[PDB]
Amino acid sequence: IEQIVVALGGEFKLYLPQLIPHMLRVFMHDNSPGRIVSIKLLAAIQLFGANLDDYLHLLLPPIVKLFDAPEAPLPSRKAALETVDRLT
Amino acid sequence: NVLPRDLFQKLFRQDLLVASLFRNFLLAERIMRSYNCTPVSSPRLPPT
């Protein structure tokens, strides 16, 4: 995904809505040790850039639930916070 | 609403053609932004 985003750039927003359902399922149920697959997906969202304009309302609640969940581990919470920093 | 009063009268009031270019520049900034492009101006404007 990260390589498709840098390749297409502005044209990625045509295809992003197809991928959104899978990304939202990743946050809901991530059993990855220390949720490192979540941290990777945050690093991808940073690359998305101004593509996320029309879809930020979809991605942001999962990210917000991620860094506010106390059960979640600190690395994954820092990764979510740093992502919001970049997207700002 | 976005620019400081001083810089507004400099660009948007002095002469028509410059004012027209900057008026249309704001539209360029919006459109090109949606294709990973950022227009650049010499008197730097805050993002509108």
Short mmCIF file of all heavy atoms in Angstrom, two decimals, chain A residues 1 3 10 12 19 28 31-33 42 45 50 52 55 57 59 61 63-65 67-68 74-75 78 80 86:
data_model
loop_
_atom_site.label_atom_id
_atom_site.label_comp_id
_atom_site.label_asym_id
_atom_site.label_seq_id
_atom_site.Cartn_x
_atom_site.Cartn_y
_atom_site.Cartn_z
N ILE A 1 0.83 -1.20 0.00
CA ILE A 1 0.00 0.00 0.00
C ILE A 1 0.87 1.25 0.00
O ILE A 1 0.63 2.19 -0.77
CB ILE A 1 -0.97 -0.01 1.20
CG1 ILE A 1 -2.02 -1.11 1.03
CG2 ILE A 1 -1.64 1.34 1.36
CD1 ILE A 1 -2.75 -1.46 2.31
N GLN A 3 3.74 1.71 -1.18
CA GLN A 3 4.38 1.92 -2.48
C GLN A 3 3.38 2.38 -3.54
O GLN A 3 3.76 3.14 -4.44
CB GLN A 3 5.08 0.63 -2.93
CG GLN A 3 6.21 0.22 -2.01
CD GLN A 3 7.01 -0.95 -2.55
OE1 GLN A 3 7.90 -0.77 -3.38
NE2 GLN A 3 6.70 -2.15 -2.08
N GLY A 10 -1.72 11.71 -6.08
CA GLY A 10 -3.05 12.31 -6.10
C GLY A 10 -4.14 11.38 -6.59
O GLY A 10 -5.29 11.50 -6.17
N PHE A 12 -4.56 8.31 -5.95
CA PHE A 12 -4.86 7.20 -5.05
C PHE A 12 -6.24 7.32 -4.43
O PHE A 12 -6.85 6.31 -4.07
CB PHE A 12 -3.79 7.11 -3.96
CG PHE A 12 -3.97 5.93 -3.04
CD1 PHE A 12 -3.95 4.64 -3.54
CD2 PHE A 12 -4.15 6.12 -1.68
CE1 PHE A 12 -4.12 3.56 -2.70
CE2 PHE A 12 -4.31 5.04 -0.83
CZ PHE A 12 -4.30 3.76 -1.34
N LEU A 19 -10.23 0.14 -0.15
CA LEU A 19 -9.37 -0.42 0.88
C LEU A 19 -9.85 -0.09 2.29
O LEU A 19 -9.53 -0.83 3.23
CB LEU A 19 -7.93 0.08 0.69
CG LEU A 19 -7.17 -0.49 -0.50
CD1 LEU A 19 -6.17 0.52 -1.03
CD2 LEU A 19 -6.47 -1.79 -0.12
N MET A 28 -10.28 -2.69 14.71
CA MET A 28 -11.24 -3.38 15.56
C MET A 28 -10.65 -4.63 16.20
O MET A 28 -10.66 -4.78 17.43
CB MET A 28 -12.50 -3.72 14.76
CG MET A 28 -13.41 -2.54 14.50
SD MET A 28 -14.86 -2.97 13.52
CE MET A 28 -16.07 -1.85 14.22
N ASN A 31 -4.87 -8.79 16.61
CA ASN A 31 -4.26 -9.69 17.58
C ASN A 31 -2.74 -9.73 17.45
O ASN A 31 -2.10 -10.57 18.09
CB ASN A 31 -4.83 -11.10 17.42
CG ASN A 31 -6.30 -11.17 17.77
OD1 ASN A 31 -7.07 -10.25 17.48
ND2 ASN A 31 -6.71 -12.27 18.40
N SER A 32 -2.16 -8.86 16.63
CA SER A 32 -0.72 -8.83 16.44
C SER A 32 0.00 -8.58 17.76
O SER A 32 -0.41 -7.69 18.52
CB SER A 32 -0.35 -7.76 15.42
OG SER A 32 1.06 -7.66 15.29
N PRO A 33 1.04 -9.36 18.09
CA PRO A 33 1.83 -9.08 19.30
C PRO A 33 2.27 -7.63 19.41
O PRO A 33 3.07 -7.15 18.59
CB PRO A 33 3.03 -10.02 19.14
CG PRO A 33 2.47 -11.19 18.40
CD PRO A 33 1.42 -10.63 17.46
N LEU A 42 -0.48 2.77 10.63
CA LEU A 42 -0.36 4.19 10.93
C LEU A 42 0.71 4.85 10.07
O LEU A 42 0.48 5.91 9.48
CB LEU A 42 -0.07 4.40 12.42
CG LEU A 42 -1.27 4.59 13.36
CD1 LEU A 42 -2.26 5.59 12.77
CD2 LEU A 42 -1.96 3.28 13.68
N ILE A 45 -0.71 5.52 6.72
CA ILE A 45 -1.65 6.65 6.72
C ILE A 45 -0.91 7.98 6.65
O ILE A 45 -1.41 8.94 6.05
CB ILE A 45 -2.56 6.56 7.96
CG1 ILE A 45 -3.55 5.40 7.81
CG2 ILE A 45 -3.33 7.86 8.17
CD1 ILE A 45 -4.17 4.96 9.12
N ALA A 50 -2.83 14.39 1.48
CA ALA A 50 -4.07 15.08 1.15
C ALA A 50 -5.10 14.18 0.45
O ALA A 50 -6.21 14.64 0.14
CB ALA A 50 -3.78 16.29 0.27
N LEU A 52 -6.47 11.81 2.08
CA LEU A 52 -7.38 11.46 3.16
C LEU A 52 -8.47 12.50 3.39
O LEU A 52 -9.36 12.25 4.20
CB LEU A 52 -6.59 11.25 4.46
CG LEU A 52 -7.14 10.20 5.43
CD1 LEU A 52 -7.58 8.95 4.69
CD2 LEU A 52 -6.10 9.86 6.50
N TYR A 55 -11.92 11.31 3.23
CA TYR A 55 -12.14 10.10 4.01
C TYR A 55 -11.61 10.20 5.43
O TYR A 55 -11.61 9.20 6.16
CB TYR A 55 -11.51 8.89 3.30
CG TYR A 55 -11.98 8.72 1.88
CD1 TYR A 55 -11.21 9.18 0.81
CD2 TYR A 55 -13.20 8.13 1.59
CE1 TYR A 55 -11.64 9.03 -0.49
CE2 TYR A 55 -13.64 7.98 0.29
CZ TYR A 55 -12.85 8.43 -0.75
OH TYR A 55 -13.28 8.29 -2.05
N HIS A 57 -12.85 11.61 8.06
CA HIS A 57 -13.91 11.28 9.01
C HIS A 57 -14.06 9.78 9.22
O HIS A 57 -14.56 9.35 10.27
CB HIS A 57 -15.23 11.89 8.54
CG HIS A 57 -15.74 11.32 7.26
ND1 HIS A 57 -15.40 11.84 6.03
CD2 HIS A 57 -16.55 10.27 7.01
CE1 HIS A 57 -15.98 11.14 5.07
NE2 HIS A 57 -16.69 10.18 5.64
N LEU A 59 -11.29 7.44 8.80
CA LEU A 59 -10.08 6.90 9.41
C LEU A 59 -9.86 7.41 10.83
O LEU A 59 -9.30 6.69 11.67
CB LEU A 59 -8.86 7.25 8.55
CG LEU A 59 -8.43 6.22 7.50
CD1 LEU A 59 -8.18 4.87 8.16
CD2 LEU A 59 -9.47 6.10 6.39
N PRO A 61 -11.72 8.30 13.70
CA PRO A 61 -12.25 7.64 14.91
C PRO A 61 -11.46 6.39 15.31
O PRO A 61 -11.15 6.24 16.50
CB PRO A 61 -13.71 7.32 14.55
CG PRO A 61 -13.91 7.80 13.13
CD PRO A 61 -12.82 8.77 12.85
N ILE A 63 -8.30 5.77 14.76
CA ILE A 63 -7.03 6.27 15.28
C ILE A 63 -7.22 6.89 16.66
O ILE A 63 -6.38 6.72 17.55
CB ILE A 63 -6.42 7.28 14.28
CG1 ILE A 63 -5.98 6.56 13.01
CG2 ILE A 63 -5.24 8.01 14.91
CD1 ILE A 63 -5.77 7.48 11.83
N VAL A 64 -8.33 7.60 16.86
CA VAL A 64 -8.59 8.24 18.14
C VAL A 64 -8.84 7.20 19.23
O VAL A 64 -8.33 7.31 20.35
CB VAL A 64 -9.76 9.23 18.02
CG1 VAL A 64 -10.19 9.72 19.38
CG2 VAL A 64 -9.38 10.39 17.12
N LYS A 65 -9.64 6.18 18.91
CA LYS A 65 -9.84 5.07 19.84
C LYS A 65 -8.53 4.34 20.14
O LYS A 65 -8.36 3.79 21.24
CB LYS A 65 -10.87 4.09 19.27
CG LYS A 65 -11.10 2.84 20.11
CD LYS A 65 -12.31 2.06 19.62
CE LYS A 65 -13.56 2.41 20.43
NZ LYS A 65 -14.04 3.79 20.16
N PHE A 67 -5.27 5.60 20.37
CA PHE A 67 -4.38 6.26 21.31
C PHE A 67 -5.05 6.62 22.63
O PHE A 67 -4.36 7.04 23.56
CB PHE A 67 -3.72 7.49 20.66
CG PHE A 67 -4.65 8.66 20.39
CD1 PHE A 67 -5.20 9.40 21.43
CD2 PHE A 67 -4.94 9.03 19.09
CE1 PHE A 67 -6.04 10.47 21.17
CE2 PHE A 67 -5.77 10.10 18.82
CZ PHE A 67 -6.32 10.82 19.86
N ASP A 68 -6.37 6.49 22.73
CA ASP A 68 -7.06 6.71 23.99
C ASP A 68 -7.31 5.42 24.77
O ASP A 68 -7.60 5.49 25.97
CB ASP A 68 -8.40 7.41 23.76
CG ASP A 68 -8.88 8.19 24.97
OD1 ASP A 68 -8.07 8.96 25.53
OD2 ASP A 68 -10.05 8.03 25.36
N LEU A 74 1.88 1.07 24.92
CA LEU A 74 2.39 2.43 24.73
C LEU A 74 3.00 2.64 23.35
O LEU A 74 2.70 3.68 22.73
CB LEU A 74 3.38 2.77 25.86
CG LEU A 74 2.77 3.15 27.21
CD1 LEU A 74 3.80 2.99 28.32
CD2 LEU A 74 2.24 4.57 27.17
N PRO A 75 3.88 1.77 22.84
CA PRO A 75 4.35 1.94 21.44
C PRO A 75 3.25 2.23 20.44
O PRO A 75 3.38 3.18 19.65
CB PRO A 75 5.04 0.59 21.14
CG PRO A 75 5.06 -0.18 22.45
CD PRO A 75 4.69 0.76 23.54
N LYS A 78 1.95 5.83 21.00
CA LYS A 78 2.85 6.83 20.44
C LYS A 78 2.76 6.88 18.92
O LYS A 78 2.79 7.96 18.32
CB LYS A 78 4.29 6.54 20.88
CG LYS A 78 4.56 6.82 22.35
CD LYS A 78 5.97 6.40 22.74
CE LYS A 78 6.18 6.51 24.24
NZ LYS A 78 7.44 5.85 24.67
N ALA A 80 0.18 6.19 17.03
CA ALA A 80 -1.05 6.89 16.65
C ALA A 80 -0.92 8.39 16.85
O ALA A 80 -1.36 9.18 16.00
CB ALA A 80 -2.23 6.34 17.45
N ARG A 86 1.69 14.30 12.13
CA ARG A 86 2.02 14.43 10.71
C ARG A 86 0.82 14.90 9.90
O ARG A 86 0.91 15.87 9.13
CB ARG A 86 2.55 13.10 10.17
CG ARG A 86 3.89 12.68 10.76
CD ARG A 86 4.99 13.65 10.38
NE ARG A 86 6.09 13.66 11.34
CZ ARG A 86 6.03 14.21 12.55
NH1 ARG A 86 4.94 14.83 12.97
NH2 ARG A 86 7.09 14.15 13.34
#
